[PDB]
Amino acid sequence: LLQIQPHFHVEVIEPKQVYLLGEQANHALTGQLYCQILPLLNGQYTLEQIVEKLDGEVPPEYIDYVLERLAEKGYLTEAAPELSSEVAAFWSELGIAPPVAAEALRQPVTLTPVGNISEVTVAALTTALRDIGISVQTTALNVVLTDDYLQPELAKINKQALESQQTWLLVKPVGSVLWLGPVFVPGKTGCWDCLAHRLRGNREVEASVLRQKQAQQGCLPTARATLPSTLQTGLQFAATEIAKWIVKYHVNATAPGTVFFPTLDGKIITLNHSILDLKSHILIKRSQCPTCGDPKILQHRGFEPLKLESRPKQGHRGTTPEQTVQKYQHLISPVTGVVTELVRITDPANPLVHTYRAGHSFGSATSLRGLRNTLKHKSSGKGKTDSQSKASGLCEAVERYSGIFQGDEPRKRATLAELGDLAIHPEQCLCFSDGQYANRETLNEQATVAHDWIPQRFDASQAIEWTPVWSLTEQTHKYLPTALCYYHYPLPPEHRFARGDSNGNAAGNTLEEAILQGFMELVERDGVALWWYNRLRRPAVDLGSFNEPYFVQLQQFYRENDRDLWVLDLTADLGIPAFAGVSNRKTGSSERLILGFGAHLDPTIAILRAVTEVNQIGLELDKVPDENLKSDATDWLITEKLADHPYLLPDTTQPLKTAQDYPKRWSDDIYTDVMTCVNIAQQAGLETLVIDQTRPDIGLNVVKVTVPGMRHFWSRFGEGRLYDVPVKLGWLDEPLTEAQMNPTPMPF
Amino acid sequence: TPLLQIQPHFHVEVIEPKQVYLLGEQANHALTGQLYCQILPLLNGQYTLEQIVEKLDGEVPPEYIDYVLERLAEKGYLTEAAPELSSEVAAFWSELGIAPPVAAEALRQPVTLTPVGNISEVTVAALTTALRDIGISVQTPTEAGSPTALNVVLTDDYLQPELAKINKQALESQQTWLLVKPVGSVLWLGPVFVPGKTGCWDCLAHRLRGNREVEASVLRQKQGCLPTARATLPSTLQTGLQFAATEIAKWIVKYHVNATAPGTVFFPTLDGKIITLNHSILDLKSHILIKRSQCPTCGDPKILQHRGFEPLKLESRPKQHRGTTPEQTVQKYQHLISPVTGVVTELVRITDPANPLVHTYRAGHSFGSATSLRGLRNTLKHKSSGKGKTDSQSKASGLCEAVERYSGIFQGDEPRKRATLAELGDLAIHPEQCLCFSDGQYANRETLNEQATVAHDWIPQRFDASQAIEWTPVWSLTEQTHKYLPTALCYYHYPLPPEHRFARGDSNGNAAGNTLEEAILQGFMELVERDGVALWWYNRLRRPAVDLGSFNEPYFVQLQQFYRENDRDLWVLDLTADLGIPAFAGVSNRKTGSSERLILGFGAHLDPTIAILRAVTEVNQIGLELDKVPDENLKSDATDWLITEKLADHPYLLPDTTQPLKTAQDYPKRWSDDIYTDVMTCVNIAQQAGLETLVIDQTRPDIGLNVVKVTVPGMRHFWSRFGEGRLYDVPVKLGWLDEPLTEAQMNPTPMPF
Amino acid sequence: QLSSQLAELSEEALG
Amino acid sequence: QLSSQLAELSEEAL
Ligand SMILES: Nc1ncnc2c1ncn2[C@@H]1O[C@H](COP(=O)(O)OP(=O)(O)O)[C@@H](O)[C@H]1O
Ligand SMILES: Nc1ncnc2c1ncn2[C@@H]1O[C@H](COP(=O)(O)OP(=O)(O)O)[C@@H](O)[C@H]1O
Ligand SMILES: [Mg+2]
Ligand SMILES: [Mg+2]
Ligand SMILES: [Mg+2]
Ligand SMILES: [Mg+2]
Ligand SMILES: [Mg+2]
Ligand SMILES: [Mg+2]
Ligand SMILES: [Zn+2]
Ligand SMILES: [Zn+2]
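Above: the input entities. Below: the structure tokens describing the complete assembly.
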């Protein structure tokens, strides 16, 4: 018996039209014949028992032509006496014929509770499945019910799924947030461990609580908030997705392709019952997954040479910030992602100030103190425009993640002796003075600033892990200790010789884009170090001399917001443009001295980076009262004054720096720019080293550039450039002593 | 003897020396203190204060215990336990910040269920069961029954005519009620209607009717609502009813805590919100219901009537052009994007984000009254669109055009007065002063309309001045008083009798803006744009090109190169006429290919840089995405023009090398930093040319975004309207022609775009 | 030779 | 002046 698609409502509008009105699509048929024949295409008539009721009005030959034309256009379908009128309309609406669906749902399923899921809950899901024509065997699909996605029993299920090639679905229907999915398809989707790697990083407080717990000698039960309605909502919701998967699976095993409606394969759906929000989270299959992939990928890549190539430019990056955001948006997810969120912190009405918050990163905390020290350090976006600030925030968040030690990084155990000339002593990079090391504990105990932490002396007699790094200058591999190359590398309590920092770390759309930025960050910090700790008087910059209105407009904005803004030149022996933005509050309780830095071959971009960093740090803080200030730079912001720090304001003894004071040395190619920088460094006696931190499951390129000898802008007073460069440039006639270096640490 | 407990949604983890962690699914907390580690394990719900004091009679004394609990209580960690609630249910409510004994009391409030349309009685019974399982009791409603905290209405469609009656009783009875549609492939959930606070069902219906143009057109043709709820699994039904049960519970609890203590509850509920859960695909959308101030049912439908006859408050709007950023504009009006409760269907970028030179959006179109399948597809086309030098600008452009087009539509509450041309006398403006159709055009209108290739060249019937008609007050900025135009000219789709259809409301001069003066300025510039195009196009004038390398704008040059790289040439023509306000035409042809795809775009502004920018981004908007479509699959108006017409057929499209290139200095600077000063500059420039400038404020209070139609009688549309006036006269006044053209010598090719 | 009744038959998706 | 264990009491959202 013949019928038009059961999900269509039929309304005849007589002379030439009949409309097919659906909930998600509407169609229109034109022709008087349609008006005559369609009313009898409701399922209540045969090709036989039709002609008997309209012959003498429409020939059998005309009917066939119409009942053929509706076929190869897709309006005709068969019935299935097995399905209700309602169910059949559901599958036809997805573009699946009723009888096939009935055949698909015939396929059985298995349910497996894990964790604390009761059998009454299992029985409820069974009932939900019955009701839609799906039986449970006591398979094509295994359904696992959990109270938490990090339940250790899932690791075993996952390994068995992989060896058995069993496709399975995860669901958490208890708690105030429903988790639904993914459907794992071995050799196609990621595995549970691909997911678990993300979850473990995104559960920082839970992770540290467990550490704190174990130290006192897999997950904790937080799924406590459940209504019988939210439970039923999740089970019933899952039954629908189970049916959709089975039906899609049944048809594609036959006509692969051809069925395109979305399923939970490679996706996790979260439905927050408390606040009412539904989000879709994409699971990335990690090629370096130790369970379903090859964990040796980063090891192998690290010991092979670095291959750079031409990168034409199209503000000297090779792609738009809109595009970078677009292809890496999927990383934004507290569940499957690496970036917790990406929020515009500043007022959209303001066209000059754009700062984003990109919140979440993780570590290693074993105490409440360190746990709130983590969680406090947020990734932030910086920009002249909203789009650039967005990309900045997103990419920094992925930058910080990629630098975190996972345990698969390229490494080999050795002493400094048995590596010889290839190995770089950590002291060449850290540059702490002998006096600082000697008075470690006393000095560290006296804090105003945590990042000034003095590590234990490196003990060359100890075997350590060394990471291979590519030298762009000498075109061969060198070695840094792994502890310097990545964040949160675990060291023995009695050989804590380093804490991996972020200086020279950078993300980019390509490797050479990232390397260029990383290098410039090093010149920036080195420039600040020379200026800050020698307390040099520097010339200001005439911001009107650059063909960039933004600078002086921003100055005017600061002016209207109780502030002065000025920029100092920090350009040193490498000759690369580098600057410090400085601003003080004119009224209020405190001066709130704030600083921002930038360096770039293009001085306009360098200044722009500096001034937008001032926006990033200081302006949101002017919002919050002195008493409410919990920022790391609190004491500085409240108590310190411009009068007691003359090296902050411009030297009126020197002329204003202008655009013409900065020679152009950038090209049309980012690769060339990188090779220009490395040679500049080489002429200054410095070696440029790169470690590629790019993670395959992330994609966005991340590196750490290291130039041993170049100074960090933290309080590190070992011999070297900090003392010598200012004299080489004539800024000082004789070097300062260690005891003459700025006793006030750079607080940002 | 009440039981004390740390709120049960927290898992308590004591880390023995000085720490205890409160781990929750949606928030985590840490308490520091010897005493906390000591006392917390006794706050699990099994203990009264009395019991804890003796349980700890060893070390901690009573007054210390008291101080600890006060602190926990004041910071919101401690609460009374509700014996009648399971730990899991109490946890759900404590996580929403509700004390479990308060939640338990709120849940005792009875509710009523009411089916409408074809909702079954077992469906009603299932929801009843769902509610009962979470502690909520159900009663049956009656026509004059005592009030309840919530009436839940289950429908198969949100435009079921019976909802109008329910809505009327609810407003008079001050009854709060909920709508839900648990049948069909898309669950609709909400809103909760609160009479006096939220919008009414009529507020919603007014949006729904509009966003269902297929349904509406079928209904018009047929001569209410129709179904479409066929597709239902028993799992999707139950998903919808259980979901509804949760939101019902959350509403009644919220309502209980705000009866006393207003504003102490934060968590979202379905008040003024609709949730759609598409079951077939997977997607969840929240749709904001705006309470319409001019609602015929719950509001004052005579606002716009009153406002029309009030004078126009214009004031200084400093530019920081336009008064705000496009990102602010978008944010403030994002909520208007919704195919259910909104006025714009969608807002999507169509162009490649990797391209930093081209930014076009399509904003989903609204509706017209169409009585035919012909009418549908036409009023289903003409999507609103955005264009920009940047992504944010194009986004704002698309959104604001969509709201602009909606705000111009005749709803039936617009300022009107029934009168003849005579009774109003000189305040009245004859419609022919605006239309400017020729006498010949009117006489032969029926044949000409039948032979016309282009729809917008429709010649209306003549205006019978003897007929009483509806005139709409318009503000004259030149004379600072009210004039009158026929309502049929001031708004879209104003219905006229078939024997007296003397006008169709057009879009010329219509504009939106963050302020009135912003919208007026843009509207005015649109008028000079079309006038300029009309002069050039229909006189087929040869115009000089523009040296785009003389404006200090790198974008023009970059775009030309981008065109060169994508099989096109791009140039600009000067259309600046007697008003001296710079106006331009961007023109571009394909090199190679089957057809030349002649495309063009226009723009006018006080700032010639912006004018060229408008023109050239419009050619981007119209053409670039059309190029990749082959001639066969080309749709839309102008297809004939695109495939057939060549540059050799229209030499007035390319610049005449007889004249020098227009440079930046050829355009005197006449714009300020005040938008208001700029419009008063425009009103006076027009007045100098002997032209009056009128304004009709089309701003709808439920929309917010200002929308106007600016009308300057005499200025030409770029449509084929060949009545006497500027079309013939301006070119000779400027020395562009030695003699006027006759009507018969006007360009026989209608301007395609 | 096709009957006009059969020829005027068109089908389209409004959306 | 407040006793140490009373004074050390603190709470915070993480
Ligand atoms: N448009 C972009 N494309 C790719 N990466 C970017 C982009 N903008 C910024 N980043 C990256 O994001 C991080 C933050 O950038 P930025 O805020 O400019 O510098 P920093 O935070 O070092 O002062 C850097 O690693 C940078 O390389
Ligand atoms: N940034 C903005 N803020 C408010 N309204 C805008 C903005 N940009 C464009 N619009 C409005 O959106 C509509 C479309 O703008 P645009 O595409 O620039 O002009 P047109 O479509 O008339 O050529 C116009 O009514 C305009 O006033
Ligand atoms: Mg940063
Ligand atoms: Mg950085
Ligand atoms: Mg920085
Ligand atoms: Mg437009
Ligand atoms: Mg317009
Ligand atoms: Mg336009
Ligand atoms: Zn895996
Ligand atoms: Zn209303």
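Note for the figure: DSSP finds 24 helices and 24 strands in chain A.
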